[PDB]
C-alpha cells in the first residue's frame, strides 16, 4: 500500500533535483532555468494512487544583457535562437554568444560547434537570403583587383 506514498518521494526528489540544477548553473550565460510540472493519477475508484511528473518546462524569457566587450559575442533580446552544426552534420540550437576562431579560422563556440549562416556569393560579394546555410569563415586570402566599369 506504499505505491502512493513512495510516488511522492520520487516527485519530491525530482522537484528538489530541478531546484538544485537551477542554482548549480548560476551565472551561465546560455542557461535557461526549468520548472517542475506534476500530475495526479486516478486508475482505481475514488482513491488517489500517487503523483506523476509531466516534464520540466524551461523559462524562455530573456535575462539581463551584460557588456563584456570583444567582437565574437552577440546577444538576443527577444524571440530567436542560433543554429549550429557539428562534425557529423546535425543541427543544434543555442543562445550562447561565446565565440572563438580556431586554427581552421571558423566561428566556433567553446565546445566545438560551427556557426552557420547564409554564404556571401557573387561579384561584388553579397548575402543572398535564398541559399542553404553554410559555416561562416574568415579567410586570410586577399580579394582580387577589380576592373573599373562604372563611375
Amino acid at each position: 500500500s506504499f505505491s502512493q506514498a513512495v510516488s511522492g518521494l520520487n516527485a519530491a526528489a525530482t522537484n528538489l533535483d530541478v531546484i538544485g540544477n537551477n542554482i548549480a548553473n548560476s551565472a551561465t550565460y546560455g542557461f535557461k532555468s526549468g520548472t517542475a510540472s506534476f500530475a495526479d493519477m486516478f486508475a482505481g475508484s475514488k482513491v488517489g494512487l500517487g503523483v506523476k511528473v509531466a516534464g520540466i518546462t524551461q523559462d524562455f524569457t530573456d535575462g539581463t544583457t551584460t557588456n563584456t566587450g570583444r567582437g565574437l559575442d552577440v546577444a538576443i533580446s527577444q524571440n530567436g535562437f542560433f543554429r549550429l552544426v557539428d562534425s557529423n552534420g546535425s543541427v543544434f540550437y543555442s543562445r550562447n554568444g561565446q565565440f572563438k576562431l580556431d586554427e581552421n579560422r571558423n566561428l566556433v563556440n567553446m565546445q566545438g560547434m560551427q556557426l552557420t549562416g547564409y554564404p556571401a556569393t557573387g561579384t561584388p560579394p553579397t548575402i543572398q537570403q535564398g541559399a542553404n546555410p553554410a559555416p561562416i569563415t574568415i579567410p586570410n586570402t586577399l580579394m582580387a583587383a577589380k576592373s573599373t566599369t562604372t563611375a
Binding site: 500500500s1 506514498a5 513512495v6 511522492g8 518521494l9 519530491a12 526528489a13 522537484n15 528538489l16 531546484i19 542554482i23 548553473n25 551565472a27 551561465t28 550565460y29 532555468s33 524551461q58 524562455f60 524569457t61 530573456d62 535575462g63 539581463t64 544583457t65 551584460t66 557588456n67 563584456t68 570583444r70 559575442d73 552577440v74 546577444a75 538576443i76 533580446s77 524571440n79 530567436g80 535562437f81 542560433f82 543554429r83 549550429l84 543541427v91 543544434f92 540550437y93 543555442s94 543562445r95 550562447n96 554568444g97 565546445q111 556557426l115 549562416g117 547564409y118 554564404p119 556571401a120 560579394p125 553579397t126 537570403q129 546555410p133 553554410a134 569563415t137 574568415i138 586577399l142 580579394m143
Partner: protein, 99 residues
C-alpha cells in the same frame, strides 16, 4: 581592409520554432529539435519574428537566487512530510504482521 572597402562574408541565421518547450537540452548548453516542436523556420535577424542582436553583449542566466532559496526550504519540508507517511505505513503494518 586597408583599401577603404567594405565586404560581407555572411549573415547570422535565426530559427524560431512554432512551439517552444519542445527543445530537449543535450550535452552542453544547446538544444536539439524534434517532433512536437515544428520546423526550424530559418530567417534573418532584421525582419520577421526574429529580434535584433547586439554585438558585445551577452545574456544573463535569467535566474533569481531569492526565489530558489525560499523554494528550497519549501521543497525540503515536503520531502520530509512524505517521509512521515512511510514511517506511519511502516508502523501500521508492523502491528498487523505481529498481531
Amino acid at each position: 581592409y586597408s583599401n577603404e572597402q567594405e565586404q560581407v562574408l555572411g549573415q547570422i541565421v535565426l530559427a524560431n520554432f512554432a512551439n517552444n518547450e519542445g527543445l530537449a537540452s543535450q550535452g552542453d548548453n544547446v538544444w536539439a529539435a524534434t517532433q512536437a516542436s515544428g520546423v526550424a523556420l530559418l530567417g534573418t535577424a532584421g525582419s520577421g519574428n526574429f529580434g535584433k542582436l547586439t554585438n558585445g553583449a551577452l545574456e544573463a542566466s535569467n535566474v533569481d537566487l531569492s526565489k530558489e532559496l525560499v523554494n528550497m526550504i519549501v521543497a525540503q519540508r515536503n520531502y520530509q512530510s512524505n517521509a512521515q507517511t512511510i514511517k506511519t505505513q511502516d508502523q501500521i503494518l508492523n502491528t498487523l504482521v505481529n498481531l
